[PDB]
């Protein structure tokens with residue numbers, strides 16, 4: 001059971017040891033397409049690559065994009081984890097969103113972090129300045145945005161200019177999650193996660209939600225681990241039946257390096273334990289997260 005195991009790891013100060021134990025057991029699968037010379041400029045980070053067996057293929061030409069399908073069989077939820085698109089891969093990114101029928105995009109980083117450019121500016125910032133990705137023949141329009149104190153929700157219109165079919169994509173942009181760090185509180189993380197959940201973006205009627213940060217493994221892995229653990233617990237209505245470390249190891253069969261620090265692992269435990277209160281029927285804790293997260297400020 002998570003609470004007892006969590007209390008033990010703190011009491012012994014062994015989060016680092018628990019975390020390398022997961023690094024050491026994680027799966028190792030080949031990434032030969034990602035390492036092809038013709039794909040070097042499609043990878044943001046030399047050491048962050050999708051496994052061949054789970055990589056998303058574009059229906060083009062060159063089908064490579066740095067993105068992985070995390071298919072959680074038991075939870076019955078899939079996610080697409082991907083790096084922050086580069087200047088030359090923004091068209092690929094939206095082609096993947098289109099082809100995979102995703103409804104939601106979860107962005108856990110800022111475009112500029114810590115001095116450096118972690119993500120291209122791949123969505124329009126003004127309604128009147130739409131973007132056209134010439135190479136993939138898609139048009140992208142900012143329809144509206146709801147700016148909260150530490151995150152922003154945007155409605156975008158994605159249009160395939162070939163067919164002139166159009167889709168509404170929701171963009172969930174977490175603004176205050178430092179790279180290699182943790183959210184300010186479980187409440188602010190869970191308040192955000194439940195905004196994504198309530199949008200319908202995670203429904204099985206849609207394609208997999210697209211989740212990214214800069215590399216698509218650290219913050220992105222933390223978000224997916226927490227969500228999947230809560231969903232597994234929700235389906236069984238049994239918190240004590242969730243083995244978080246085995247869930248993480250299952251996810252790392254599909255993408256390397258998910259969760260980059262022991263403290264991100266520790267935070268995942270904190271989010272799931274707190275989120276269990278909502279899952280097991282204390283509805284009022286959601287509005288309590290909304291308060292603690294100070295979303296309504298500025």
Ligand code: VO4
Nearest residue numbers: 214215217218219
């Ligand atoms: O942009 V991340 O270093 O949380 O994969």
